[PDB]
Scaffold this active site. Sequence first.
Site, PDB file in Angstrom:
ATOM      1  N   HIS A 114       1.241  -4.734   2.537  1.00 24.91           N
ATOM      2  CA  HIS A 114       0.086  -4.803   2.933  1.00 24.91           C
ATOM      3  C   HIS A 114      -0.813  -5.976   2.679  1.00 24.91           C
ATOM      4  CE1 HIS A 114      -3.964  -2.600   2.791  1.00 24.91           C
ATOM      5  NE2 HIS A 114      -4.318  -3.185   1.590  1.00 24.91           N
ATOM      6  N   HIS A 115      -0.919  -6.773   1.565  1.00 23.50           N
ATOM      7  CA  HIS A 115      -1.786  -7.874   1.426  1.00 23.50           C
ATOM      8  C   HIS A 115      -0.715  -9.032   0.608  1.00 23.50           C
ATOM      9  CE1 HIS A 115      -5.642  -9.488   0.617  1.00 23.50           C
ATOM     10  NE2 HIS A 115      -5.477  -9.882  -0.665  1.00 23.50           N
TER      11      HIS A 115
ATOM     12  N   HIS B 161       0.962  -1.174  -0.029  1.00 18.21           N
ATOM     13  CA  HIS B 161       0.023  -0.058  -0.116  1.00 18.21           C
ATOM     14  C   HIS B 161       0.693   1.259  -0.053  1.00 18.21           C
ATOM     15  CE1 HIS B 161      -3.245   2.636   0.744  1.00 18.21           C
ATOM     16  NE2 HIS B 161      -4.184   1.468   0.726  1.00 18.21           N
TER      17      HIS B 161
ATOM     18  N   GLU C 227      -7.273   4.491   0.404  1.00 20.83           N
ATOM     19  CA  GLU C 227      -7.017   4.857  -0.895  1.00 20.83           C
ATOM     20  C   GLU C 227      -8.459   6.018  -1.347  1.00 20.83           C
ATOM     21  OE1 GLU C 227      -5.083   2.820  -3.531  1.00 20.83           O
ATOM     22  OE2 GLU C 227      -7.012   1.732  -4.099  1.00 20.83           O
TER      23      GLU C 227
ATOM     24  N   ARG D  69      -1.725   0.310  -7.078  1.00 16.56           N
ATOM     25  CA  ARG D  69      -0.761   0.296  -6.163  1.00 16.56           C
ATOM     26  C   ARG D  69       0.495   0.033  -6.324  1.00 16.56           C
ATOM     27  NH1 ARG D  69      -6.290  -0.418  -2.536  1.00 16.56           N
ATOM     28  NH2 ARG D  69      -5.322  -1.758  -1.192  1.00 16.56           N
TER      29      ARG D  69
ATOM     30  N   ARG E  42      -3.859  -7.135  -6.568  1.00 17.96           N
ATOM     31  CA  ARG E  42      -5.361  -7.323  -6.011  1.00 17.96           C
ATOM     32  C   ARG E  42      -6.037  -5.772  -6.013  1.00 17.96           C
ATOM     33  NH1 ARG E  42      -7.605  -5.299  -1.489  1.00 17.96           N
ATOM     34  NH2 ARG E  42      -5.759  -5.671  -0.231  1.00 17.96           N
TER      35      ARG E  42
ATOM     36  N   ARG F  89      -7.649   9.972  -1.884  1.00 18.86           N
ATOM     37  CA  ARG F  89      -7.293  10.327  -3.405  1.00 18.86           C
ATOM     38  C   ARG F  89      -8.257  10.309  -4.268  1.00 18.86           C
ATOM     39  NH1 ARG F  89      -3.540   6.026  -4.371  1.00 18.86           N
ATOM     40  NH2 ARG F  89      -3.794   5.442  -1.987  1.00 18.86           N
TER      41      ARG F  89
HETATM   42  C1  LIG Z   1      -5.224  -1.577   6.772  1.00 15.59           C
HETATM   43  C2  LIG Z   1      -5.872  -2.803   5.977  1.00 15.59           C
HETATM   44  C3  LIG Z   1      -6.966  -2.026   5.064  1.00 15.59           C
HETATM   45  C4  LIG Z   1      -7.793  -2.864   4.157  1.00 15.59           C
HETATM   46  N1  LIG Z   1      -8.734  -2.268   3.551  1.00 15.59           N
HETATM   47  C5  LIG Z   1      -9.550  -3.274   2.770  1.00 15.59           C
HETATM   48  C6  LIG Z   1     -10.773  -2.689   2.262  1.00 15.59           C
HETATM   49  O1  LIG Z   1     -11.236  -1.506   2.274  1.00 15.59           O
HETATM   50  N2  LIG Z   1     -11.459  -3.289   1.031  1.00 15.59           N
HETATM   51  C7  LIG Z   1     -10.994  -4.493   0.646  1.00 15.59           C
HETATM   52  O2  LIG Z   1     -11.450  -5.153  -0.079  1.00 15.59           O
HETATM   53  N3  LIG Z   1      -9.756  -4.978   1.642  1.00 15.59           N
HETATM   54  C8  LIG Z   1      -9.174  -4.272   2.443  1.00 15.59           C
HETATM   55  N4  LIG Z   1      -8.050  -5.003   2.788  1.00 15.59           N
HETATM   56  C9  LIG Z   1      -7.996  -6.146   2.505  1.00 15.59           C
HETATM   57  C10 LIG Z   1      -8.888  -7.151   3.581  1.00 15.59           C
HETATM   58  O3  LIG Z   1      -8.381  -6.671   4.910  1.00 15.59           O
HETATM   59  C11 LIG Z   1      -8.541  -8.673   3.679  1.00 15.59           C
HETATM   60  O4  LIG Z   1      -6.987  -8.537   3.110  1.00 15.59           O
HETATM   61  C12 LIG Z   1      -8.671  -9.620   5.046  1.00 15.59           C
HETATM   62  O5  LIG Z   1      -9.892  -9.049   5.317  1.00 15.59           O
HETATM   63  C13 LIG Z   1      -8.183 -10.656   4.995  1.00 15.59           C
HETATM   64  O6  LIG Z   1      -9.410 -11.436   5.285  1.00 15.59           O
HETATM   65  P1  LIG Z   1      -9.311 -12.923   6.076  1.00 15.59           P
HETATM   66  O7  LIG Z   1     -10.532 -13.519   6.543  1.00 15.59           O
HETATM   67  O8  LIG Z   1      -8.760 -13.969   5.169  1.00 15.59           O
HETATM   68  O9  LIG Z   1      -8.184 -12.707   7.241  1.00 15.59           O
HETATM   69  P2  LIG Z   1      -8.237 -11.826   8.677  1.00 15.59           P
HETATM   70  O10 LIG Z   1      -9.048 -10.674   8.673  1.00 15.59           O
HETATM   71  O11 LIG Z   1      -6.602 -11.249   8.716  1.00 15.59           O
HETATM   72  O12 LIG Z   1      -8.476 -12.970   9.706  1.00 15.59           O
HETATM   73  C14 LIG Z   1      -7.502 -13.624  10.552  1.00 15.59           C
HETATM   74  C15 LIG Z   1      -7.257 -15.044  11.361  1.00 15.59           C
HETATM   75  O13 LIG Z   1      -6.144 -15.950  11.404  1.00 15.59           O
HETATM   76  C16 LIG Z   1      -5.762 -15.809  12.838  1.00 15.59           C
HETATM   77  N5  LIG Z   1      -4.972 -16.779  12.770  1.00 15.59           N
HETATM   78  C17 LIG Z   1      -3.730 -16.863  11.494  1.00 15.59           C
HETATM   79  N6  LIG Z   1      -3.210 -18.027  11.788  1.00 15.59           N
HETATM   80  C18 LIG Z   1      -3.773 -18.766  13.049  1.00 15.59           C
HETATM   81  C19 LIG Z   1      -3.940 -20.038  13.329  1.00 15.59           C
HETATM   82  N7  LIG Z   1      -2.639 -20.839  13.185  1.00 15.59           N
HETATM   83  N8  LIG Z   1      -4.488 -20.479  14.375  1.00 15.59           N
HETATM   84  C20 LIG Z   1      -5.531 -19.749  14.825  1.00 15.59           C
HETATM   85  N9  LIG Z   1      -5.935 -18.416  14.382  1.00 15.59           N
HETATM   86  C21 LIG Z   1      -5.007 -18.118  13.110  1.00 15.59           C
HETATM   87  C22 LIG Z   1      -5.246 -14.588  12.609  1.00 15.59           C
HETATM   88  O14 LIG Z   1      -4.347 -14.094  13.505  1.00 15.59           O
HETATM   89  C23 LIG Z   1      -6.398 -13.863  11.743  1.00 15.59           C
HETATM   90  O15 LIG Z   1      -7.277 -13.144  12.961  1.00 15.59           O
HETATM   91  C24 LIG Z   1      -7.436  -4.235   3.920  1.00 15.59           C
HETATM   92  C25 LIG Z   1      -6.502  -4.861   4.610  1.00 15.59           C
HETATM   93  C26 LIG Z   1      -5.722  -3.978   5.654  1.00 15.59           C
HETATM   94  C27 LIG Z   1      -4.941  -4.599   6.513  1.00 15.59           C
HETATM   95  O1  LIG Z   2      -9.446   1.716   1.365  1.00 15.19           O
HETATM   96  C1  LIG Z   2      -8.194   1.516   1.084  1.00 15.19           C
HETATM   97  O2  LIG Z   2      -7.609   2.574   0.492  1.00 15.19           O
HETATM   98  C2  LIG Z   2      -7.815   0.111   0.724  1.00 15.19           C
HETATM   99  C3  LIG Z   2      -8.617  -0.755   0.152  1.00 15.19           C
HETATM  100  C4  LIG Z   2      -8.044  -2.541   0.141  1.00 15.19           C
HETATM  101  O3  LIG Z   2      -7.045  -2.758   0.576  1.00 15.19           O
HETATM  102  O4  LIG Z   2      -8.936  -3.172  -0.445  1.00 15.19           O
END
Ligand SMILES: Cc1cc2nc3c(=O)[nH]c(=O)nc-3n(C[C@H](O)[C@@H](O)[C@@H](O)COP(=O)(O)OP(=O)(O)OC[C@H]3O[C@@H](n4cnc5c(N)ncnc54)[C@H](O)[C@@H]3O)c2cc1C
Ligand SMILES: O=C(O)/C=C/C(=O)O
Length: 560
Positions: free
Chosen positions: A494-495, A356, A369, A393, A535, A372
């Site tokens: 970030h991802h 990011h 994002e 990105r 992504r 902007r």
């Molecule tokens: C700051 C930020 C902003 C972003 N904003 C956006 C957005 O606006 N729109 C968008 O589409 N995407 C966004 N993204 C992308 C979205 O965040 C995904 O990348 C995130 O949702 C991933 O979902 P998930 O369910 O896979 O995992 P997560 O939400 O990370 O859930 C994770 C669980 O697994 C637990 N875990 C891991 N390993 C183990 C294990 N071995 N045993 C037990 N528990 C475990 C972890 O610690 C974690 O809590 C953002 C990400 C970040 C960090």
């Molecule tokens: O809101 C943002 O800028 C990030 C979005 C994402 O990581 O999908």
Amino acid sequence: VLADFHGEMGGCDSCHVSDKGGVTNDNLTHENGQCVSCHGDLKELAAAAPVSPHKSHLIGEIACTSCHKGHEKSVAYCDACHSFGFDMPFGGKWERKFVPVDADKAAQDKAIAAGVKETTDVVIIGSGGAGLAAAVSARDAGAKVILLEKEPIPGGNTKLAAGGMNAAETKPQAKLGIEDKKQIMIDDTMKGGRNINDPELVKVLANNSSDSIDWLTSMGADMTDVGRMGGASVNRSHRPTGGAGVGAHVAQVLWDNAVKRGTDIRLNSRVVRILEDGKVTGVLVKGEYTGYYVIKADAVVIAAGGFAKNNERVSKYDPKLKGFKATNHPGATGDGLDVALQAGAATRDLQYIQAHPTYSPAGGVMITEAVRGNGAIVVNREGNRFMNEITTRDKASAAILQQKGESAYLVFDDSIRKSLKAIEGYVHLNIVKEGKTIEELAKQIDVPAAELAKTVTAYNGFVSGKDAQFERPDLPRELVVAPFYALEIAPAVHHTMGGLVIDTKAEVKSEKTAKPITGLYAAGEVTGGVHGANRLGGNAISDIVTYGRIAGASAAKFAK
Ligand SMILES: Cc1cc2nc3c(=O)[nH]c(=O)nc-3n(C[C@H](O)[C@@H](O)[C@@H](O)COP(=O)(O)OP(=O)(O)OC[C@H]3O[C@@H](n4cnc5c(N)ncnc54)[C@H](O)[C@@H]3O)c2cc1C
Ligand SMILES: O=C(O)/C=C/C(=O)O
Ligand code: HEC
Ligand code: HEC
Ligand code: HEC
Ligand code: HEC
């Protein structure tokens, strides 16, 4: 440390359930019950405050003990990302040393044979949006579920989400006069992913969009304010009203519903080995306080998310990022992948790691994002523009990297501020520079006034529909209603777009047998192929929800 301060009082009994000591279960319910019994709960504590550690954006149950540690120094969990310098009674510094998922093998072996403790239908690894969505779905007409989370508080990176969940068509879209269509979903998603995306995955990632955004809606969600994320056409990043954030909002709503149905959710519980019939038989759990233990189950959903955050590993595939900062929570280090790999899963696109471009050093947070997208421009140390601010990105991370001092300055208006409410949070964090005029802004920022002003006046001309500097395709607002603000920002890991290989049913495929390992499911950032090599903003949350649901349901039919 807190339990001595309390030993002085009444004993072991105060907190623990027995006078000898020890914890019953890893969610630490008893003890936290004890806490609240003498001190009140978080709303009570929060009301008493005059930025308070007892009232924040974190979602789900937030144990007292996730900060107030008994037998060791205590640390606000807020320090994992901010530096609020709170004066935590029995204080300590935040420190996390990553420990291998395979270390203490003897111990793990010794403990696998040593009884068989509980059995459930479907086990789900992790509590972010994909694991909770799976929870709802498995549970929701089907099976018994037992979700583990290793962190002391829930919702992974999901809960930090800022800018929107992509969906196409038939979401509320109708009601705003946003004209959009499914193939445009696919088609941008391939383009942004540089066309390697598994085509069948981006398909259901297109074709279930609206329903996931309706499902959320059947559950309590508020997906109605729509915007523009870098990389798409028709406007489609769904969020809560007026520019708030969807992550917290979604996490919360699926935390509630997962809890509401019968999910058995357990924190401070890290899965360290999937149990091998080679069918998935169960799982080896290291509960932080209760020790190791086996859970027999028939399907395992892997929803552990990505590895951004592990700089050792990310530096491993792209050593450009060695030393970089991350925008994730502490939990994203790859445990999931490792667990799966030991199980013999297949992966893909592991080396494509998304940074990011606009993280803030000072604040230790991503800065969305959408700033902007609603009109902000970015400015280098010399006072000028250098990029089309709504590009991809990877290109925007590259360009700020190639600039004076490796960092750059988001620069916006009182008009952009008003219009995107995430900006009040940045304001609340003391990380936003203010100018009653652009010349005022420059002095704060240490960028030259005539150059920044000429930049901004010129940008305004481009705003007149044509960026004769950098081609920015959208020029939303003019940048001329005072006060004027700015933030310095730089790129942060970030991802991780790669991950386990799965089909449209969420099944995980074996590296060796190129078919699914049986009753081994996955969904979310831990998986590979949905995003190709890049992504799109807004595609993580929609991938997580729609794939969770599938992962849950698939796993439920299995065992049934
Ligand atoms: C700051 C930020 C902003 C972003 N904003 C956006 C957005 O606006 N729109 C968008 O589409 N995407 C966004 N993204 C992308 C979205 O965040 C995904 O990348 C995130 O949702 C991933 O979902 P998930 O369910 O896979 O995992 P997560 O939400 O990370 O859930 C994770 C669980 O697994 C637990 N875990 C891991 N390993 C183990 C294990 N071995 N045993 C037990 N528990 C475990 C972890 O610690 C974690 O809590 C953002 C990400 C970040 C960090
Ligand atoms: O809101 C943002 O800028 C990030 C979005 C994402 O990581 O999908
Ligand atoms: C009497 C002197 C005590 C004995 C014996 C034990 N405790 Fe505690 N306890 C408390 C918490 C919040 C925890 C969880 C982990 C932590 O936050 O440190 C625990 C855990 C234990 C453990 C496990 C050891 C480990 O950390 O792995 C043991 C053996 C244990 N407890 C025994 C809280 C409290 C508390 C409230 C403030 C009191 C008064 C005590 N504990 C006292 C004892
Ligand atoms: C559950 C594990 C907890 C947690 C997290 C805390 N308590 Fe207690 N507490 C009690 C009393 C009577 C006091 C003393 C007041 C005084 O001496 O002025 C305390 C103290 C604390 C603190 C205070 C640190 C400070 O001095 O500011 C904190 C942070 C704290 N506790 C947290 C009473 C009780 C109980 C009644 C039997 C129980 C149970 C707990 N506390 C348990 C917890
Ligand atoms: C981390 C996010 C915390 C959680 C969750 C809880 N507490 Fe807390 N607590 C935390 C800090 C950083 C501080 C002190 C600094 C500040 O500026 O407030 C505290 C303070 C207390 C106190 C003393 C203050 C008071 O009003 O008495 C108590 C008794 C206390 N905390 C108890 C408590 C309980 C019962 C909680 C569960 C609901 C709890 N805390 C959550 C950090 C964090
Ligand atoms: C890392 C996972 C975090 C932890 C743990 C905490 N916060 Fe946070 N916080 C984080 C991000 C990425 C953001 C910004 C979201 C955005 O919209 O772009 C924030 C935001 C805040 C704010 C400002 C916005 C608001 O909603 O008030 C504050 C005041 C804040 N955070 C405080 C805070 C506290 C008190 C926490 C402990 C309970 C805490 N944060 C945890 C990242 C993370």
